[PDB]
Amino acid sequence: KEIDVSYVKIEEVIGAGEFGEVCRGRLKAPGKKESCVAIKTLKGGYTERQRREFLSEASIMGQFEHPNIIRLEGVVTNSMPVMILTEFMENGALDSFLRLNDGQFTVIQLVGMLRGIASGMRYLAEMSYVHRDLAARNILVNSNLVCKVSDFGLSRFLEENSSDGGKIPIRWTAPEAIAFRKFTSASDAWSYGIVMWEVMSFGERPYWDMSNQDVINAIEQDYRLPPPPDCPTSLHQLMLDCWQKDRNARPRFPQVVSALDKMIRNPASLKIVA
Ligand SMILES: CS(=O)(=O)Nc1cccc(Nc2nccc(Nc3c(Cl)ccc4c3OCO4)n2)c1
Ligand SMILES: [Mg+2]
Ligand SMILES: [Mg+2]
Ligand SMILES: [Mg+2]
């Protein structure tokens, strides 16, 4: 949807993306109430390939409609700068939000967040969309603590293409996806287990200071991240399930959502910690 630039007001720069700024703003279109939006801008200096890559995120977002997937409002393409407008998520990236709020949200709240992410992923997998970069940094959080999946793009990672989408995010990526580049919803399930660990650790870095190669070797040699401090054993077990070496043994996203829904209905169960 092409948005007339007169309908957009940019209010403040709130972040930086791959190709430019991220801004908070307001969108007011004839017949609709004004709404808050996030705005990604692409200014001069870019190649047309880069413009197409930039705008591909909007095309993909535009294919989706789900309360746990960032909603596209529109694009500005017939003017400079080129812009992508989405709903506004007041609290930004989940990893930094949790680090700011370390130890300040209850287990039930954290499970709620995890459930929102898992529902987003359930939807993507139902749509045969493989995310490939599922990580807490790609989850955005609104004022009501609703978590939504972001970061959409279909470009191969650098390891896939010519001998001579960026690099594979090793610490989030399933071992078969690293080894063979086979990215599937089951490799996303692996990544989701890592997101779980990030959330329950209030945004610690997966594998701390281990090198990418150390992580790869450790996983092959059966190492798995330990439960974070105070983490319910049932959540850590779900993480381990997500991290099965055999991709076919990992839970699919409907089963993940079901498991989390049971926890929420049975919060006593979350009292058992190591
Ligand atoms: C995490 S940040 O973007 O570096 N900083 C930030 C800080 C506070 C709130 C938001 N909030 C926020 N809310 C919604 C989206 C985004 N970023 C974003 C993404 Cl992720 C993808 C595509 C588009 C946008 O904006 C428009 O197009 N941000 C972002
Ligand atoms: Mg991506
Ligand atoms: Mg990415
Ligand atoms: Mg801590």
Swiss-Prot record:
Subcellular location: Cell membrane
Effect listed in the UniProt record for changing residue 256 to E: In CMAVM2; uncertain significance
Documented effect of changing residue 253 to L: In CMAVM2; loss of tyrosine phosphorylation; loss of interaction with RASA1
Annotated phenotype, changing residue 206 to L: In CMAVM2; uncertain significance
Modified residues (Phosphoserine): 162-163
Record-annotated active site: 133
Effect of residue 57 to K: In CMAVM2; the mutant protein is not detected by Western blot; loss of localization to cell membrane
Topology, Cytoplasmic side: 1-274
Effect of residue 168 to S: In LMPHM7; loss of kinase activity
Summary of the tissues where the protein is detected: Abundantly expressed in placenta but also detected in kidney, liver, lung, pancreas, skeletal muscle and heart. Expressed in primitive and myeloid, but not lymphoid, hematopoietic cells. Also observed in cell lines derived from liver, breast, colon, lung, melanocyte and cervix.
Protein kinase domain ranges (all copies): 8-274
Result after altering residue 224 to W: In CMAVM2; the mutant protein is not detected by Western blot; loss of localization to cell membrane
Entry comment on modification after translation: Phosphorylated; autophosphorylation is stimulated by EFNB2.
Annotated consequence of substituting residue 193 to R: In CMAVM2; uncertain significance
Entry superkingdom: Eukaryota
Chain sites annotated for binding ATP: 14-22, 40
Disease: Lymphatic malformation 7: A form of primary lymphedema, a disease characterized by swelling of body parts due to developmental anomalies and functional defects of the lymphatic system. Patients with lymphedema may suffer from recurrent local infections. LMPHM7 is an autosomal dominant form with variable expressivity. Some individuals present with severe non-immune hydrops fetalis, which may cause perinatal demise or fully resolve after the neonatal period. Others present with no edema and have milder clinical features, such as atrial septal defect or varicose veins as adults.
Family, per entry: Belongs to the protein kinase superfamily. Tyr protein kinase family. Ephrin receptor subfamily.
Subunit field text: Heterotetramer upon binding of the ligand. The heterotetramer is composed of an ephrin dimer and a receptor dimer. Oligomerization is probably required to induce biological responses. Interacts with RASA1; the interaction depends on EPHB4 tyrosine-phosphorylation.
Biological role stated in the UniProt entry: Receptor tyrosine kinase which binds promiscuously transmembrane ephrin-B family ligands residing on adjacent cells, leading to contact-dependent bidirectional signaling into neighboring cells. The signaling pathway downstream of the receptor is referred to as forward signaling while the signaling pathway downstream of the ephrin ligand is referred to as reverse signaling.
Protein name: Ephrin type-B receptor 4
From-to range in the entire protein, with total length: 608 to 888 of 987
